[PDB]
Amino acid sequence: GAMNSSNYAELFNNDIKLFVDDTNVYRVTVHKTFEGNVATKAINGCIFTLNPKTGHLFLKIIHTSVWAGQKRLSQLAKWKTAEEVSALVRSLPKEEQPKQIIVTRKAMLDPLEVHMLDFPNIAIRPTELRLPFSAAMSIDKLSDVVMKATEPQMVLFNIYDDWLDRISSYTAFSRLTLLLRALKTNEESAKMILLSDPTITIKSYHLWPSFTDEQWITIESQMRDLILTEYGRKYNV
Amino acid sequence: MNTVPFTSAPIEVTIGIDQYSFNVKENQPFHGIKDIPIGHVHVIHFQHADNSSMRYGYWFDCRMGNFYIQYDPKDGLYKMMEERDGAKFENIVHNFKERQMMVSYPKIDEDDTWYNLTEFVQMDKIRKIVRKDENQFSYVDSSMTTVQENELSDPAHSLNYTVINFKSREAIRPGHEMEDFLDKSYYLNTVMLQGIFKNSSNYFGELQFAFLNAMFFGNYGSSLQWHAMIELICSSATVPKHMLDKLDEILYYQIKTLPEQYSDILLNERVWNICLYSSFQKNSLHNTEKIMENKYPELL
Numbered sequence A: 001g002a003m004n005s006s007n008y009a010e011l012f013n014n015d016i017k018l019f020v021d022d023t024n025v026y027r028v029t030v031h032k033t034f035e036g037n038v039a040t041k042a043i044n045g046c047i048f049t050l051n052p053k054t055g056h057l058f059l060k061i062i063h064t065s066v067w068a069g070q071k072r073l074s075q076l077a078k079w080k081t082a083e084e085v086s087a088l089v090r091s092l093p094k095e096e097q098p099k100q101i102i103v104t105r106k107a108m109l110d111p112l113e114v115h116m117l118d119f120p121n122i123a124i125r126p127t128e129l130r131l132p133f134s135a136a137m138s139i140d141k142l143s144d145v146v147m148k149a150t151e152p153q154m155v156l157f158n159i160y161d162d163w164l165d166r167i168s169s170y171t172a173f174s175r176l177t178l179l180l181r182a183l184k185t186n187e188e189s190a191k192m193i194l195l196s197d198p199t200i201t202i203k204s205y206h207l208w209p210s211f212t213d214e215q216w217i218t219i220e221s222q223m224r225d226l227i228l229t230e231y232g233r234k235y236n237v
Numbered sequence B: 001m002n003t004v005p006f007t008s009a010p011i012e013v014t015i016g017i018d019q020y021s022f023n024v025k026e027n028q029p030f031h032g033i034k035d036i037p038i039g040h041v042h043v044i045h046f047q048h049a050d051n052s053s054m055r056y057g058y059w060f061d062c063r064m065g066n067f068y069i070q071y072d073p074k075d076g077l078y079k080m081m082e083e084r085d086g087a088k089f090e091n092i093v094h095n096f097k098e099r100q101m102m103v104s105y106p107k108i109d110e111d112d113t114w115y116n117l118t119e120f121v122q123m124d125k126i127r128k129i130v131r132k133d134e135n136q137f138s139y140v141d142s143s144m145t146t147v148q149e150n151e152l153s154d155p156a157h158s159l160n161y162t163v164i165n166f167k168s169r170e171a172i173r174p175g176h177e178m179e180d181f182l183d184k185s186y187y188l189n190t191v192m193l194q195g196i197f198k199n200s201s202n203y204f205g206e207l208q209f210a211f212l213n214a215m216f217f218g219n220y221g222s223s224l225q226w227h228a229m230i231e232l233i234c235s236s237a238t239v240p241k242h243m244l245d246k247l248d249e250i251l252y253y254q255i256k257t258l259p260e261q262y263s264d265i266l267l268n269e270r271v272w273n274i275c276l277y278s279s280f281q282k283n284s285l286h287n288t289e290k291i292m293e294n295k296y297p298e299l300l
């Protein structure tokens, strides 16, 4: 059934699973027309498909051309997501295909179930967690590849960099979700924290800075503060 | 006009004949039902006074044989049987009509209700949903499950309705996933109407039979089937104009006939609100929408 606080450790067991987040698939800027009406202009999007155990991120870039001449784009976007996730699963060797796919929004359940009918053994699950994966586009290198795309494109990342050399998947996921929650709550401050110190760099082949274990504890503490703070600044507490 | 005689009525029982019903007291002198209109299927059904558990009954057509009811004290129910000896049955039933031990099927001449509820229902199709080929009549009760229910456990006692499943490969063409899920016309017109049912009359026949088993026996899987068949039409953008017009008549009489106090269990809020207000056919069911709004506005 649904994924929640009670079965959180299942994410890090040895059954292959993927999170699918569709928030950033259909992205628009709203603007005024010459006549004073409102119109949208779409910008490139992405499907965020993540193995929480390994960090492997299948970033399917959604080029604005896929919306050309289509109607009801917010509805189409969920079926396009489901089509692309199904195509990804079919492209993986059998022993790499997930046993479960967890969607971060419940409106993906029927679209993905229908597209995955050929895979009756793959469980499509919702979650009660409020996961911060929409903030993926706050990661500079991910945002950069999406915006620069001139055609549909799949780009592979490890969203944990090399962290699993030193920490467990559970701890890596908790770090990721803390970083993303911070970026979602106050992007400017979160990025200031991550890059305040010029001496700590981002390796060419990484997404996040090369913090030592001690520096990560400091960083993680700072992100928590930001989240509690903003929670005050928002609620006045 | 035909007759279903009773050897006796040994246990107190409410007897239904089509949409009518009457109470027979323990060892009251009851010998049967006369003046049954020819040309329609009928259902004769029972609810024991001591155990309202298990409504049960028999679908039959008097054109297919002479049928009578005898109480079986071992199995504890009123059983339909066919009398092969025509002259004996005629001598037995005349004898009975002379002693006036029969209730008369009480059809008002203005009244087209039963016709309207059974317009497309044919004994031969009933006997394929209810498989018991040694009898010309078909037993149904409250508890029988459908083939689809069993897939999700005794097969010989199942209601073999046509399986409808909106999230199934049968319903969804590869590469038309979104198209076929949001507009079920393919599934309705090609898979079901052209493929399985052959024509709309057979489709409506099963739909009406499912409703009647839901209403008369409280058969839950029949109610599931009725709603699924309605939803499959309402969720199709492309339906023949004659089917929509007939569907509206069919549902109108079903809603008209439903007991007011059973609407809470026999009517699926989601299906009806979707069908009348959200679906492609939201504007094609004027009679049904008007009776539903005036009789069950709460459900909506």
Ligand SMILES: CCn1nnnc1NCc1cccs1
Pocket (backbone or CB within 6 Å): B005, B006, B007, B008, B068, B083, B089, B092
């Ligand atoms: C009083 C019952 N009776 N009287 N004379 N014969 C019978 N057998 C019962 C029936 C057999 C077929 C229909 S009714």
